[PDB]
């Protein structure tokens, strides 16, 4: 939803933005 997808690396963002 942000740019293209947040599932391809939900793990990385999961810690990048809680």
Curated annotation (Swiss-Prot):
This is Thrombin heavy chain.
